[PDB]
Structures are given as C-alpha cells and as structure tokens.
C-alpha cells in the first residue's frame, strides 16, 4: 500500500467547499502599494572547451580527487 499517485487533486473538489475564517500569518498586509514604470645535473636517468558531462569533467574529477581522497 504505497501508490505512486497517477494524478493530483483537482482544484474543483476544493473549490466547492465553504470557507474557513482562520487567518494565517504571511497574509498580514505588507508592501501595501505597488510601483510603476515611467655538469652534475645530467646524472639522473632522463637525458633531455566546457565538456558537457559530469563525472568526466575536469572540475568534478579534481574535487573528488581531493575530498574522498
């Protein structure tokens, strides 16, 4: 008994109802009026855009190359 909804409640079922009279909070009058417009170094062994995707991205692979570590 979990069912995925297939629907939504038509406003009409509400619309027929009679009112309440409760007053909520956010309806207190505010913004009450509008506005208008007018040598050694040789020793060592060696002789001398935006890619639309995510887990292949450059950033994201940096990030996860930091944090999960």
């Amino acid at each position: 008994s979990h069912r995925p909804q297939l629907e939504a409640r038509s406003g009409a079922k509400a619309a027929a109802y009679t009112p309440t009279g409760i007053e909520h909070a956010r309806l207190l009058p505010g913004h009450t009026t509008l506005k208008y417009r007018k040598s050694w170094r040789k020793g060592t062994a060696f002789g001398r855009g935006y890619i639309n995707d995510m887990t292949k991205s450059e950033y994201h692979q940096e990030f996860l190359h930091k944090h999960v570590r």
Partner: protein, 338 residues
C-alpha cells in the same frame, strides 16, 4: 587507451633497479623454507597483530567470530597452519571479493578495505615475514624513513639536526643558497602497474611469492551493488601493501637521486650509514644534493647552491620561460601561518 608507461620508460626503469641491486650486491629472498629456524615466532607476531583488532571489542559480528575461530586454531596447530600457508602461497591464485566502505572525516574521506579472513591470516604472516627478511638483509637504505628507529616527531628533530649541523649552509657570504623541496607523489599506488611489478619483484623475491602478490591484487570490489574488477591500481588495505609501496617509491628515488648520489647516502653495503652521515664534507660537497628524505608520499630535499651552478639552472629555466611580466611571483606559494 592501453598501458601508459610506453615500453621505453619501462625498460629504463627496470634497468635502473637492476644496476642498483647488482651494484648494491643484494641477495634475493627465498620462499619460506619447509624447515625454518625462526618460523613460529613470526607467526606469533602476525597473529597477535590480528588479535589486537579484537582486543577491545565486546560485540563480535559474524565475520569476526569466523576470525577468532581461525585464530584459535592457528594458535593450537602451528605446524598445521604453517603447512597450510606455504601450500597456499605455492599455489592459490584466485581470491574472494573485497569490500570498500568509506569512512568519514567530516572533511575528507578515506577508503577502508576489508579482506577475507584466511587471506588475511596468510598475508599477515607474509607481511611480517617480508619486513623481517628484508630489514634482515638491509634492503632499504637510510633515507627511506617512516621507519623503525624514530617516532615521527623525533624524525623531525634529527631532520633539523641534519639540516643545520651539516657543514656550512649558513654562510651567505657570496650568493650562496640552499633550497628545500616539499612534495607529494600525487597518485602513487594508483598508477602502480602490475606487469611492471611482477618483474621488479622477480628481482628481489622468488617468482612464486611475487606471483602471489600481483595475483593477490586483482579482486572484484563489492561496494553494495556497485562492483568492479580491480585491474590496475593498488589496494593498500592488503596487509602487505605497505612493503611493496615503500619498494615502489625506492624506484622513484633512484631516479631523483640517480645512481651516484645514492651511493653517497648508502655508502657500502658493508657500512650503510646512520641517518645523517657522510665520509668527508666533500661527500656532501661532491654534489648539490645534501639531504634527501622521503616519507610515505611526501618527498623532502635540500639543495646547496652557489651562484655558479644555480645561475646556470636559472639560465636553463629562464632561457625556456622568459617572463617580461615578472609575474612568476604570483602563483608561487609559501605558508599562511607564519
């Protein structure tokens, strides 16, 4: 995309380790022999090492209980088990999966592997056995030191005493300079490449045991549903995954030094130095490189320079990276604490 190293680099590296070793005149390890003089001792150690995970616990879960069984018998029947293992290494190449679960730092994360108990017990024996035979035969030279003799802060200390009390660094009379590198190896293991390994281990260890390792890595990895063979990099939670790790970095090192300067640091195998030692001051001064110390990842190096050599470098560098900007001081980084 195939193997990255290219065969070229491969050959160069291997040859390096080779002339090191033969020049170093080192005898490789034999597989643990059937008649061994030390053996049950070593197994004493490893098993206590597993024991200690569970010393504290009160609730013991299923795999655990499985373990304590496997242990208790292992105490009881040392010649039994020793035979069981030496069998296992001589043969078995295929292994149960492995389990990652990541553990949290609230800032970063770290992988926590889990092996499977028999595989563990073998390993721990072999881990222990490696370190003992190696350090017995003085594999690693001084300068590789997350080592025995020095707990970390003491390592800092003798590293200072190294810095200073070597001859002369503080005479600025001319232009004279000295420069430390602080580094990481980036990914280090996660590029460790088996086919390279199993060879480089054919150097220092019997073809079998090494085989047991290279074939000891690849496993499935089950994180819950997600699962994949591990074909390439390195799983460190393997009991021995320390050792080879150090090993591999040695290869890095014999590069960064290059043969000679290493031969400074080691001296003969007959007279390997203490940490900070040389023979004459010149042994320091035969080269710009004075200290080299590599701790796990971080590499730490000390160059001693005079305007001659150093301005010949900045001749190289500058020559190839002229900056009329003079902005090379922007991204450059030093400490925010001081």
């Amino acid at each position: 995309n195939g193997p990255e190293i290219t065969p070229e680099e491969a050959t160069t590296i291997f040859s390096v380790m080779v002339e090191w070793l033969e020049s170093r005149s080192f005898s490789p390890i034999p597989f643990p022999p059937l008649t061994y003089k030390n053996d049950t001792k070593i197994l004493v150690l490893a098993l206590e090492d597993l024991k200690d995970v569970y010393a504290s616990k009160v609730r013991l879960n299923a795999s655990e209980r499985e373990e304590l069984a496997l242990i208790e018998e292992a105490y009881d029947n040392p010649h039994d088990t020793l035979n069981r293992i030496k069998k296992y290494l001589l043969t078995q190449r295929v292994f149960k999966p492995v389990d990652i679960t990541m553990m949290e730092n609230y800032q970063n994360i770290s992988p926590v592997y889990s092996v499977d108990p028999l595989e563990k017990i073998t390993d721990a024996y072999l881990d222990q056995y490696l370190w003992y035979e190696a350090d017995q035969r003085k594999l690693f030279p001084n300068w590789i030191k997350p080592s025995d003799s020095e707990i970390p802060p003491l390592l800092v200390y003798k590293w200072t005493q190294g810095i200073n009390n070597l001859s002369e660094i503080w005479d600025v009379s001319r232009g004279q300079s000295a420069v430390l590198l602080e580094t990481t190896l980036g990914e280090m293991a996660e590029k460790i490449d088996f086919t390279l390994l199993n060879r480089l281990l054919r150097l220092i260890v019997d073809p079998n045991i090494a085989d047991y390792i290279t074939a000891k890595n690849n496993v499935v990895i089950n994180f819950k549903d997600m699962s994949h063979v591990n074909k390439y990099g390195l799983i460190r939670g393997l009991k021995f995954a320390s050792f080879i790790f150090q090993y591999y970095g040695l290869v890095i090192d014999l590069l960064l030094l290059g043969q000679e300067r290493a031969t400074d640091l080691a001296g003969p195998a007959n007279n390997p130095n203490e940490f900070m030692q040389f023979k004459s001051k010149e042994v320091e001064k035969a080269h710009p490189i004075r200290l080299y110390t590599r701790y796990l990842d971080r590499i730490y190096m000390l160059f001693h320079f005079e305007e001659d050599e150093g301005e010949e470098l900045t001749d190289e560098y500058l020559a190839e990276n002229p900056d009329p900007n003079f902005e090379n001081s922007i991204g450059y980084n030093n400490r925010k604490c001081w």
